[PDB]
Write a protein that binds this ligand. Structure first.
Ligand SMILES: CCCCC[C@@H](S)C(=O)N[C@@H](Cc1ccccc1)C(=O)N[C@@H](C)C(=O)O
Ligand SMILES: *[C@@H]1O[C@H](CO)[C@@H](O)[C@H](O)[C@H]1NC(C)=O
Ligand SMILES: *[C@@H]1O[C@H](CO)[C@@H](O)[C@H](O)[C@H]1NC(C)=O
Ligand SMILES: *[C@@H]1O[C@H](CO)[C@@H](O)[C@H](O)[C@H]1NC(C)=O
Ligand SMILES: [Zn+2]
Length: 696
C-alpha cells in the first residue's frame, strides 16, 4: 500500500539519496537528512555556497537560457528588447573591443576620478560640490555614497511615498571588515590593492605616467576615509526596531540639527535634495517632510568630512561607482577583481557569462522575463492548489493564537486583524501573459544597441533610479509585485501586508501537484508560514493591517514578545560555526528569520495534521522505512542541505539575516515537539533539549 507512482518513485530516490541511513536523527538531524548530499558533492569553483537551494537557482538559469537566446519572429516588442539585452550581454569580443573607453566616457560626468587625473583640482574642483557630486551619482546612476538619500513607501502612511536619508552602504561586506585584521586582513589588503589595479589600468589607458607609490598613497587614504565612515555607521543591532529608526523631519530641522561643512561649504540639504529630484523637475522646499534613519550617522560625519579635501572624497565616491562598473568591461578590467572576490567569496573563477547575463536581464526586465519562464516552465493550476494551501495555513495561524498564552486578548484579536488581511501573490501577474501593451509599455523608454552592453548597463541604471525618483508624489501602486516571477524565493512585505510566492519556488521540492502532501506541507507549506509569520516577527509585529507603523500591542504583550523571542536570541547565539572559524552566529541580526522558521514549520505541521483528520493517511513511498509524519520533516530538512566556503561564512555570519541552513534546521527542530515525537527522541537528546523557545 506503498504508492509506486513515477512521481512517487521519483521523490523516494531524491530523499534517500540525500539522507545518510546511519546517523541518529535525534543526535544531528542535518547529517541525518543531508549526510550523503555532503559526501558526494563539492563546492564548485564559482560558488561561495552550494546546496539544493542553490542548485534550484542554477536550474532556473538554464531555462532562462532556453528561453532568452532564440529569436522568435512573433515575439512582441517587449521580449525583443530583453533578448537584444541578453545577446548584447554575452558578446565578449565586442565588450573587449572596447577596452575601458565606456567609463572614460563617464568619469567626467561624475566630476572625475582624481587618482587618474592630470591636475584634478583644476579640471573639476572649482565646480565640484557635495550636493551635485553626490547628487549626480545618486540621480543618474543611483549609486548612493556618503549620504544615502532615497525614495520609499512611507512607514506611517503606506499609500504614500517619501524621501529618506540614511547612512551609505560600504565597499566591503560589512562594517566589521574595516577592522582590517585577522580574518579580515586579506579582504582589506585586496580591496585597496583593487582600488589600485583599477586606477592603474585607467591611467595606462590614458597614456599617463604611473607613480605606484602615490597610488599606494591615494588609495590608502580612501580606505582611511571609509574606515571612519564605517565606524560612524550604526550596527545592525540598533537599526532593527522601526520605531527608533523612524524619525520624520523637514529639510528644515534637518538643515538645523545635522549641518555639514564639506570642502568648507557648508552643506545645503535643500540644494542637494533639489539637485537630485529635479531629475524629474519635481520641486522641493525647506518644509519637505523627511524620514531620517541615521540621525547619529550624520551627527558623526561632520567631524569626519570636516577634515577631508574635495579630492579626498571624490576618490572614494567615484571609486565606489567604478567598482561595480568594472565587470561590465574587458577581461583586462574584470581580471582586476579576482583577489577581491576570492577574499570575499572564496571563489577562484567567475560563473558562466550566459549565467551572469541571464540574471542581469531577469533582474532588469523581470516582468518580461517573468513571462517567458512561466510559458517554458510553470504549470498554472498550480496557482490554485497553492492558494488553498495558503488558505489552510492562514486559518491554522488563526487557530493558534487562542492557544498562545503569552498574549492578552485585545492583542490576540487585532493580530487576527492582520490575519485575514494578509493578501497573497502566487506565480505571476496574469498581467504579463495577457496584456502586451502594458508590457511593451513599461519598457518603452528602453532601447538597446547590441554592440553597446555598457551603454545599456548605463541606461538600465538611469532607468530605474528615475523610475524610482518618479514616485515621491504618487500613490503606491496597489497592483505592483515585489518579485519577478522569475525567482526562487518567497517574500513578505510590511507596507503591503503581502505574502509573495514566485513561480520560482512553486516547484519541487517545496511543491508539486503530484508528490505526497507530507512534503508539500513540509516544503512550500512551511514556506508559506515563513512569510505570514513575518507578519509578526520583531519587525512586522509593529505593522498594522495596512502597512502602517502603528502600535497595536498591549504594553504587557510587548514585553512578553521580547520576553519569548529573547529566548531564540540566546539559542542561535550559542551556535558556533566551524566553517566560520567557530565564530558565534549573531542571534539578534537573525531573530526575525529564526522566529519565522519556527512559526512557519509548526504552522504547517498543524495544517498537515488537519489533513490527516479530514482526508486520512496516504500511501507510503518505496525505499524508505519512515512514515509521512517524518517525511514531513525530511523534506523540510532537505531544503537546506549544503555547505559554505570559509570566506563567505565569515561574510554570511555578518551579512545574512538568515541563519545558515544547518542551524535553521537544528535550532528549529530543537524547538519542535512535533519533531522529537516523530523521531522518538530521548529527552535531552541534542535535538531534544528540555528548554524550548517558542513564540508563534
Ligand atoms: C532578504 C532576502 C530574503 C527575503 C525573504 C525572507 S522573509 C526569507 O526568509 N525568505 C526565505 C524564503 C524561504 C523560506 C523557507 C524556506 C525556503 C525559503 C528564505 O529563507 N530565503 C533565503 C533562501 C534567502 O533569501 O537567503
Ligand atoms: C558580437 O558583436 C560583434 C562586433 O560588434 C559582431 O561582429 C558579432 O556578430 C556579434 N556576435 C554575435 C553572435 O552576436
Ligand atoms: C544648488 O546650489 C548649488 C550651490 O549650492 C548651485 O550651483 C546649484 O545650481 C543648485 N541647484 C539647485 C537645483 O538649486
Ligand atoms: C548562550 O545561551 C545561553 C542560554 O541562556 C545564554 O544565557 C547566553 O547568553 C548565550 N551566550 C551568548 C553568546 O549569547
Ligand atoms: Zn524570511
Amino acid at each position: 500500500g506503498i504508492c509506486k507512482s513515477s512521481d512517487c518513485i521519483k521523490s523516494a530516490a531524491r530523499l534517500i539519496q540525500n539522507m545518510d541511513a546511519t546517523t541518529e536523527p535525534c543526535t544531528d538531524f542535518f547529517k541525518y537528512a543531508c549526510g550523503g548530499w555532503l559526501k558526494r558533492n563539492v563546492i564548485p569553483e564559482t560558488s561561495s555556497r552550494y546546496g539544493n537551494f542553490d542548485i534550484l537557482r542554477d536550474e532556473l538559469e538554464v531555462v532562462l537560457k532556453d528561453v532568452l537566446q532564440e529569436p522568435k519572429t512573433e515575439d512582441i516588442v517587449a521580449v525583443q528588447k530583453a533578448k537584444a539585452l541578453y545577446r548584447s550581454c554575452i558578446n565578449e569580443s565586442a565588450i573587449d573591443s572596447r577596452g575601458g573607453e565606456p567609463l572614460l566616457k563617464l568619469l567626467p560626468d561624475i566630476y572625475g576620478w582624481p587618482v587618474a587625473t592630470e591636475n584634478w583640482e583644476q579640471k573639476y574642483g572649482a565646480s565640484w560640490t557635495a550636493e551635485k557630486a553626490i547628487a549626480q551619482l545618486n540621480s543618474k546612476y543611483g549609486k548612493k555614497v556618503l549620504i544615502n538619500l532615497f525614495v520609499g513607501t512611507d512607514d506611517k502612511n503606506s499609500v504614500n511615498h517619501v524621501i529618506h536619508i540614511d547612512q551609505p552602504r560600504l565597499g566591503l561586506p560589512s562594517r566589521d571588515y574595516y577592522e582590517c585584521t585577522g580574518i579580515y586582513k586579506e579582504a582589506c589588503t585586496a580591496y585597496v590593492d583593487f582600488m589600485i589595479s583599477v586606477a592603474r589600468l585607467i591611467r595606462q589607458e590614458e597614456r599617463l605616467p604611473i607613480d605606484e607609490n602615490q597610488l599606494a598613497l591615494e588609495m590608502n587614504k580612501v580606505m582611511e576615509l571609509e574606515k571612519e565612515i564605517a565606524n560612524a555607521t550604526a550596527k545592525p543591532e540598533d537599526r532593527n526596531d522601526p520605531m527608533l529608526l523612524y524619525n520624520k523631519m523637514t529639510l528644515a530641522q534637518i538643515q538645523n540639527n545635522f549641518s555639514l561643512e564639506i570642502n568648507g561649504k557648508p552643506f545645503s540639504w535643500l540644494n542637494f535634495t533639489n539637485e537630485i529630484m529635479s531629475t524629474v523637475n519635481i520641486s522641493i522646499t525647506n518644509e519637505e517632510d523627511v524620514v531620517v534613519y541615521a540621525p547619529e550617522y550624520l551627527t558623526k560625519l561632520k567631524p569626519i568630512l570636516t577634515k577631508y579635501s574635495a579630492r579626498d572624497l571624490q576618490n572614494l565616491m567615484s571609486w565606489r561607482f567604478i567598482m561595480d562598473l568594472v565587470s561590465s568591461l574587458s577581461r583586462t578590467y574584470k581580471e582586476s577583481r579576482n583577489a577581491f572576490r576570492k577574499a570575499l567569496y572564496g571563489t577562484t573563477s567567475e560563473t558562466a557569462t550566459w549565467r551572469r547575463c541571464a540574471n542581469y536581464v531577469n533582474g532588469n526586465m523581470e516582468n518580461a522575463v517573468g513571462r517567458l519562464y512561466v510559458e517554458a516552465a510553470f504549470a498554472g493550476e498550480s496557482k490554485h492548489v497553492v492558494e488553498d494551501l495558503i488558505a489552510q495555513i492562514r486559518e491554522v495561524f488563526i487557530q493558534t493564537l487562542d492557544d498562545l498564552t503569552w498574549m492578552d486578548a485585545e492583542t490576540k484579536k487585532r493580530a487576527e486583524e492582520k490575519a485575514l488581511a494578509i493578501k497573497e501573490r502566487i506565480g505571476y501577474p496574469d498581467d504579463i501573459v495577457s496584456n502586451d501593451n502594458k508590457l511593451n509599455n513599461e519598457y518603452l523608454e528602453l532601447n538597446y544597441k547590441e554592440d553597446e552592453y555598457f551603454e545599456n548597463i548605463i541606461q538600465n541604471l538611469k532607468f530605474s533610479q528615475s523610475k524610482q525618483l518618479k514616485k515621491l508624489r504618487e500613490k503606491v501602486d496597489k497592483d505592483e509585485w515585489i518579485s519577478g516571477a522569475a525567482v526562487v524565493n518567497a517574500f513578505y512585505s510590511s507596507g503591503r501586508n503581502q505574502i509573495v510566492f514566485p513561480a520560482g519556488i512553486l516547484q519541487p521540492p517545496f511543491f508539486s501537484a503530484q508528490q505526497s502532501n507530507s512534503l508539500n506541507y513540509g516544503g512550500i507549506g512551511m514556506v508559506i508560514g515563513h512569510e505570514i509569520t513575518h507578519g509578526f516577527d520583531d519587525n512586522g509585529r509593529n505593522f498594522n493591517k495596512d502597512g502602517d507603523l502603528v502600535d497595536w500591542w498591549t504594553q504587557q504583550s510587548a514585553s512578553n514578545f521580547k520576553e519569548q523571542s529573547q529566548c531564540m536570541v540566546y539559542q542561535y547565539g550559542n551556535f558556533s560555526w566551524d566553517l566560520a572559524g567557530g565564530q558565534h552566529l549573531n542571534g539578534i541580526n537573525t531573530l526575525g528569520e529564526n522566529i519565522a522558521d519556527n512559526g512557519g514549520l509548526g504552522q504547517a505541521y498543524r495544517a498537515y495534521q488537519n489533513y490527516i483528520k479530514k482526508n486520512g493517511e496516504e500511501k507510503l513511498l518505496p525505499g524508505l522505512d519512515l512514515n509521512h509524519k517524518q517525511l514531513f520533516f525530511l523534506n523540510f530538512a532537505q531544503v537546506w542541505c549544503g555547505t559554505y566556503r570559509p570566506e563567505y561564512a565569515v561574510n554570511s555570519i555578518k551579512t545574512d539575516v538568515h541563519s545558515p541552513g544547518n542551524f535553521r534546521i537544528i535550532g528549529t527542530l530543537q524547538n519542535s515537539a512535533e519533531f522529537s515525537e516523530a523521531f522518538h527522541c530521548r529527552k535531552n537528546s541534542y535535538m531534544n533539549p528540555e528548554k524550548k523557545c517558542r513564540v508563534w
